Amino acid sequence: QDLMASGNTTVKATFGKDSSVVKWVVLAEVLVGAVMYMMTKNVKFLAGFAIISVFIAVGMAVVGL
Amino acid sequence: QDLMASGNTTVKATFGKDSSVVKWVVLAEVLVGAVMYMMTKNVKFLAGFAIISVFIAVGMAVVGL
Amino acid sequence: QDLMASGNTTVKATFGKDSSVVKWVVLAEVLVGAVMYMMTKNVKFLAGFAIISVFIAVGMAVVGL
Amino acid sequence: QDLMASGNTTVKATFGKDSSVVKWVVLAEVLVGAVMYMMTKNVKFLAGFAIISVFIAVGMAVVGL
Amino acid sequence: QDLMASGNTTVKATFGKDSSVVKWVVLAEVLVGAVMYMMTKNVKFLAGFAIISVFIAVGMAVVGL
Amino acid sequence: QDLMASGNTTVKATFGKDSSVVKWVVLAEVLVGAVMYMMTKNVKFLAGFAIISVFIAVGMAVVGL
Amino acid sequence: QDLMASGNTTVKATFGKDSSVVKWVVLAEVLVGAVMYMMTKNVKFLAGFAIISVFIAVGMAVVGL
Amino acid sequence: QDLMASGNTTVKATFGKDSSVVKWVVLAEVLVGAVMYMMTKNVKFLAGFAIISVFIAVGMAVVGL
Amino acid sequence: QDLMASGNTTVKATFGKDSSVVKWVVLAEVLVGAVMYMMTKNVKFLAGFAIISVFIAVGMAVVGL
Amino acid sequence: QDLMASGNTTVKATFGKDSSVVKWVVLAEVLVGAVMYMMTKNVKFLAGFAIISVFIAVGMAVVGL
Amino acid sequence: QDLMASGNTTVKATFGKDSSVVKWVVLAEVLVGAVMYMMTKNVKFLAGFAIISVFIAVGMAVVGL
Amino acid sequence: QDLMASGNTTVKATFGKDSSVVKWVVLAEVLVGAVMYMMTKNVKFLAGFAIISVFIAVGMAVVGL
Amino acid sequence: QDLMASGNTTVKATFGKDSSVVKWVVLAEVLVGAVMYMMTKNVKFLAGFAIISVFIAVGMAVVGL
Amino acid sequence: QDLMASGNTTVKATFGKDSSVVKWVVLAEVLVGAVMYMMTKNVKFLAGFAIISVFIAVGMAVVGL
Amino acid sequence: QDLMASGNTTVKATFGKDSSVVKWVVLAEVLVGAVMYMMTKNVKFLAGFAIISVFIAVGMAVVGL
Amino acid sequence: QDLMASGNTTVKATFGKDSSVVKWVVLAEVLVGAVMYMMTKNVKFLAGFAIISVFIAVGMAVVGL
Amino acid sequence: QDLMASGNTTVKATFGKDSSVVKWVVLAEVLVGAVMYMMTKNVKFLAGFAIISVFIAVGMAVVGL
Amino acid sequence: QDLMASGNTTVKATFGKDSSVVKWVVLAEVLVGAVMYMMTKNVKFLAGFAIISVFIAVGMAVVGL
Amino acid sequence: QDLMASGNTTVKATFGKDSSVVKWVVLAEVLVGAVMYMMTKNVKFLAGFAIISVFIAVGMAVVGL
Amino acid sequence: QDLMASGNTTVKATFGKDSSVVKWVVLAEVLVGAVMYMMTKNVKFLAGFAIISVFIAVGMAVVGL
């Protein structure tokens, strides 16, 4: 017998490296930086905009099925 | 099956590179600079007015769906 | 569907290039210069009176919706 | 007589070091970090992404049948 | 024989993507944000107002019968 | 059959865009700003006074039944 | 049916544009300025004395029921 | 019903244009000027002695209940 | 036949808009505010003193038999 | 029948506008101000000393049975 | 019945206008001034030494049972 | 009953007008003056050496138990 | 017949205003304050040391049989 | 009958004014001051070293059996 | 019975006036002064080096078992 | 039993009067003087170069284990 | 007859002051401190390492059979 | 009988003074310092790097079986 | 048995003295210095660029497995 | 297994010695010098223009992957 936990894993395709879910955060990332940059006017919050992106890239690349 | 996280993403069009949400901050940006410039009279707070703008541009351009 | 962040943006008209909010700072600008010019008697604080004005102009002109 | 608790242990192969079940968490791991990193923008939540991975590795390696 | 769990599913129409039940939360959403925004005056609670809406949209769209 | 969740929705009229409930927060909004402005004397807390208002406007306008 | 959130709104008359509650802050306003002006001797804290007043005026005028 | 925030407002009479509280600052005003005038020997700190006085006068006169 | 759940509803008069039970909380309200205000010295806890009062008013007014 | 929640309300006289319980807080009020004033040496904590007093006055006056 | 919150109020005599507890702060007052005066050498911290004293006097005099 | 806050007040004798604690500051006073006089060579820092001394004297004399 | 719940009430004498049981807490009170004062070094935990004592006094005095 | 809560109260002698338990905190007191003084280098944490000591003294003296 | 909190108090000898633990801070003391003196170059941080030492001395001498 | 805080105190040898750690600061000392001397060209910053050195010497000599 | 609850009490020797079970916690103690010290980098978690040890010592010494 | 809690204590060898588990933290230690040093640029976080190391050394040395 | 915490420690190779993770900070180090140097234009932030580097070197060299 | 922290490091190419990010600061460098040179007219701010450049060069050259 094979493993029955499988089937679909469209879940991947749902969460896939390019999917709906993934992109959203980046917008939030872009938003929240612009958000928090307003009050502080510190150049801080513009980071994961780079980082998160490449983070998720290798992050997803680690497994991503 | 496709990914079911999708549908609309009018959310994009709601947050889209030219949308309501985006522009607001810029005003705040323009405001808060004029705000904080008053007390300090330092030429500092006039930056992201350029930066944030082009920031969000490429920032949105990074993904923006 | 359209973006639901919209509606009014009388907020613009509230913050609009000629609106209530905008003008106030300029007075403060004019005031605070006269303010700080008193103690220093340095010709410094008479600037953004020009600058801020034209600043906000193009500043608002950048987007201002 | 042998032990009758045995048979299959495809359960292993179902939970096996590389199986369906295992990978899912990592995605969640990658997700939730990106999740919680948004609100805090603290570099914290990017850890078990390394840790959990190698954790489960030796963790599974401890027994994993 | 067919499935006898069926019949009506006016329940859908009762919970349907546009129904009574659905809308209520959004008001609460709009309310509670205005609620909690008062004490904190943090721009936080104005989110699901967007999110929940589009959330339920695709959320309902996932199945919604 | 129709949906039985309905009936009244005077609740709307109770929470309606112009109703009792709505206005209260604005006062609180006006109050709490004057409140917190006292201790800080920062021009911050005078915002949602604009924002919340127009916020609820489109916010209610999003659905508001 | 009408909205049952109503009744009294003497609360208004309690918070009304001229009421007890309103005036208090102004005194505090006048006080705290004189307060903080002592230590700094900066002409700063004499502002909302004008501002807050007219602020609350239009502020209350925005809704104030 | 009337507003129940009222009653006493002896608080006024406690803070009243001529009351205990009011006068104190003026002494401090007179003191701190003499204080800070010593170290600087600049004729500066003798101002609000006039200003604060008339300030509070119209200041209290603005509302003062 | 009429409903036999009735009779007395002195319970109302026992809980009535002006009764024993009602008033107690207000004292507690007044107390607990003074209570918690001591430790924090935050102006917070002086609210429901207004709110609860008018709250119960319309609250009782909603039905109160 | 009358309401049986009544009887005594010596509780009032126990909590009465002049009673034991009431006064205590004021001492604490006077204490804690002197307390917290020590560390900060900010003139802040001397307030409710006035406020709380008159607060409880009208506060008790609101109902106080 | 009388109020049972009473009895002793030696607590007063424990906190009384001349008691143990009261005096301590004044020493701290005298100390902390000498403390903080050292680092700043600003004539500031010698105040409540007068103020606190007379403060507590009338402060206690307000009620002090 | 008497006040139980009492007992010892060797604390006085520990902080007493002539005690250990008192004298220390004076040395610091003498030191820090010599300290800060070095860099400035301004005759300033030789003051509380007189002042603090007599300050603490009457200061302690105010109460000092 | 009399009430048979009685007899002994040495329980009182066991819990009596001066008994074993009573005193223990005070020690704990004294201990736990010294306990929690260590970590915080906040002057807080030295209170019920007064309060609890007089609390139990009138507290016991309320009935204490 | 006597109270049976008694017996030993070596517990006192275990917690007694001079016992093991008592002294420990003082060391911690001495330690934690030296601890927290390091990071701040504020002269603050050297207090209860006096205070706690005499505190516990009268504190224990209050009852201490 | 004796007190059972005792035994060892090698803890003393572990924390004893000359022990491991004690000395460490002094090094830190010496270090942190040299640390913070670098950035400020203020002669400040060379104090507890004397003070802490003699502080702990009498400090330990106060009890130190 | 002996004190178990001991063992190694190679920490000393790690921080020892001649160790790695010690010397570093001196370089920084030499550096920062040359650093800050550049901008001011004041002969000031050449001091602890002597002082710190001999400072740490006796400083370490005070205890240094 | 003797007590039959006895026999073995190798349980002691199993839990004995030096046994397997005892030591484990100390490692955990040492571990968890190093654990929690990482995230906070507060010097806190290095305590029971001393305390627990001597704690269990006298703790076991209290009875330990 | 001997104690049956024993056997293996490879757990030691698993946690042993030189084992896998031990070293990890040190890396984290080295990491987190470099981590937190970035944002603050305070020389603080480089400590337990020494301390934790020698800490665990004697710490493990205390028992470590 | 051997210790089962082992296996991989590719984690080392993942965090190894030359690995991905290590280098990143240095860039940040180089960045943040250039970052913070801009606003201050103080020559400060160019340090750990040397320090952190050699820091991590010996730091990793301390254990690094 | 290899280290999974890797992948991309386009991050380098994103931050690479010649990349977008790098150049920006230099402009700011050139700007801010011209900025701050205006007010002071001191020849100071024209430095890192050289320095930062070559700084980042070797700085990046130190590692830069």
Residue numbers in the entry:
A (entry chain 2N), B (entry chain 2M), C (entry chain 2L), D (entry chain 2O), E (entry chain 1O), F (entry chain 1N), ...: 6 to 70
Describing publication, verbatim:
Conjugative pili are widespread bacterial appendages that play important roles in horizontal gene transfer, in spread of antibiotic resistance genes, and as sites of phage attachment. The pilus is a polymer of the VirB2 protein (or pilin). The structures of the pED208 and F pilus are very similar, with overall dimensions of 87 Å in diameter and an internal lumen of 28 Å in diameter. Thus, selective binding of PG to pilins occurs in both F and pED208 pili, and thus, the F family of pili are polymers of a selective and stoichiometric protein-PG complex unit.
During the process of helical reconstruction, as the resolution was increased, an additional separate density became clearly visible and readily interpretable as a phospholipid. For the F pilus, it became apparent during the process of helical reconstruction that two populations of filaments were present, differing slightly in the rise between subunits (see below). Instead, two 5.0 Å resolution electron density maps were generated for the two F pilus populations. For pED208, the angle between adjacent subunits is 28.2° and the rise is 12.1 Å, while for the two F pilus structures, the helical parameters were 27.9° with a rise of 13.2 Å and 28.1° with a rise of 12.5 Å, respectively. Superposition of the structures of pED208 and F TraA reveals very similar overall structures (root-mean-squared deviation in Cα positions between pED208 and F [13.2 Å rise] of 1.4 Å and between pED208 and F [12.5 Å rise] of 1.5 Å) with slightly different boundaries for secondary structures. Also, the TraA pilin structures in the two F pilus forms are virtually identical (root-mean-squared deviation in Cα positions of 0.7 Å). Thus, with the structures and helical parameters of the two F pilus forms being so similar, functional differences between them are unlikely to arise but cannot be excluded. The amino acid sequences of both the orthologous pED208 and F pilus TraA pilin are similar, except for the F pilin N terminus, which is 4 amino acids (aa) longer. This longer N terminus could not be traced in the F pilus density maps and thus must be disordered. Indeed, the presence of phospholipid in the F pilus was also confirmed by MS; however, this time a PG species, PG 33:1 (16:0, ΔC17:0), was the major phospholipid observed in the F pilus after PLA2 treatment.
